Paper text:
Transthyretin (TTR)3 is a 55-kDa protein that aggregates into amyloid fibrils under pathological conditions. In its native tetrameric conformation, TTR transports retinol-binding protein and thyroxine (T4) in the blood and cerebrospinal fluid. Amyloid aggregation of TTR occurs by dissociation of tetrameric TTR into monomers; these partially unfold into amyloidogenic intermediates and self-associate into soluble oligomers and amyloid aggregates. Here we identify two segments of TTR that drive protein aggregation by self-association and formation of steric zipper spines of amyloid fibrils.
To pinpoint which of the eight segments drives aggregation within full-length TTR, we created individual proline substitutions within each segment. We chose the substitution to proline because it is known to inhibit fibril formation. None of the proline variants fully halted TTR aggregation, but substitutions S85P, E92P, and V94P and the S85P/E92P double substitution significantly decreased protein aggregation and altered aggregate morphology. In the isolated segment 91AEVVFT96, proline replacements in positions 92 and 94 completely prevented fibrillization. These data suggest that the 91AEVVFT96 segment and the N-terminally adjacent region of full-length TTR are important for fibril formation. We speculate that the S85P substitution, near strand F, constrains this flexibility to prevent aggregation. Substitutions in strand F, E92P and V94P, most likely hinder self-recognition and further aggregation. The side chain organization explains why the residue replacements E92P and V94P hinder TTR aggregation because the proline substitution would decrease the shape complementarity between sheets in the steric zipper structure.
Residue numbers in the entry:
A (entry chain A), B (entry chain B), C (entry chain B), D (entry chain A): 10 to 124
Amino acid sequence: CPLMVKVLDAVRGSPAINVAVHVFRKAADDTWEPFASGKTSESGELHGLTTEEEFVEGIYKVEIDTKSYWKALGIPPFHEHAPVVFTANDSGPRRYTIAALLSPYSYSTTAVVTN
Amino acid sequence: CPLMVKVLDAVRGSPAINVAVHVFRKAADDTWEPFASGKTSESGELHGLTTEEEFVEGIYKVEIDTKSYWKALGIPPFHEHAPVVFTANDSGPRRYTIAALLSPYSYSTTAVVTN
Amino acid sequence: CPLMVKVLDAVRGSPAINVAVHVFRKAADDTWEPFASGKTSESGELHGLTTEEEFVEGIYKVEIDTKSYWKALGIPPFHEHAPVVFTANDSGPRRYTIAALLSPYSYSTTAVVTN
Amino acid sequence: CPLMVKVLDAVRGSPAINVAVHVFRKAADDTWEPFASGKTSESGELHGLTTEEEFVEGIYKVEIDTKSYWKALGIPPFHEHAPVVFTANDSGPRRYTIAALLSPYSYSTTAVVTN
Ligand code: NA
Ligand code: NA
Ligand code: NA
Ligand code: NA
């Protein structure tokens, strides 16, 4: 599991469940190409997006579909989604967790990179 | 104005208006002594808490009364208040802005310190 | 001034000065079209991006160039930039402040929308 | 495990390891009484603070010793610590996670309350 996503809801104080997440990788023509996707579980986590073999160095975008999450709860949202864009760099063994904390008009994201 | 407080609401995307703020300073007997207090304005800001003369070196606690704010909006919040504790003026006077962003089950705070 | 951007630095406790910001608007062909850009001032603020006349309804992306900011401080950051994507002026004109707080491996963003 | 604490470091992009955490419970005389304490593990988590039997309804303060954490890394910090104050309410089965994300001049905290 070299790439995991964890999402929390700051309004309800809970994991953000059933949040769609789309991962893209920047192609040679400078466009974003679909790479992996899924929905967060009951724990707010999304595991199994990719494998060590497929997840090569490159520029990636992890897009968290925050607007659809808030709409499913009936809460007015501001953002369309929360894109998290970064370079994956092989610097010894690494696992990347993209964590996000969501509110209707605000969010935070952190990368947790461990060996 | 050596100490300012600014509060935003992450649910409504607005300044957090009429938020009570109590400032304490740690006394020689290690207890918290009342220092200054006030309420945020229509802009979510609280100016004029203290003066350069009164704001001496010390350990301060800026307590943002988040529970009363959320209850006045009819939303039950998780926290009792948001205390922000720091040492001030240790290397001479500085201007401190304590900013906070609120949600019912979460908050963030940052300090902007200028010379 | 219907669109303002404010950026703070969470490591130094200061405004994030000279941060490049690029604003795009989604065109009819679903591509991102350049709309406005600028750099934050000594206060960490970017004013005068657009006018009430030019800032029509649409989907906008406010891309904060966090990587160049951290690299100019000699700190390698995790993200390429911090894109903030939202629909604007859907229920008539509003004043939007996009605020962001930066750390090398994390950032937070909030929107303050006023009428 | 009815009360857990999880702490992340936004500068290094890692779990915040070996962070001291002190939990207090408000006594009848309105003072804070020590209740439980520990240090976050290699995963940034602190498990086993209390038991279902001891963790009754009441007002609690979870104080994260952020200044000692940053000092151990040699990074200049602003806050003395990050106190998180809340009422524990029995409203069916509940587990409380106090999560925090730390930067030298800023932090965020969220409560994740699950059944
Ligand atoms: Na994976
Ligand atoms: Na003042
Ligand atoms: Na403008
Ligand atoms: Na426990």
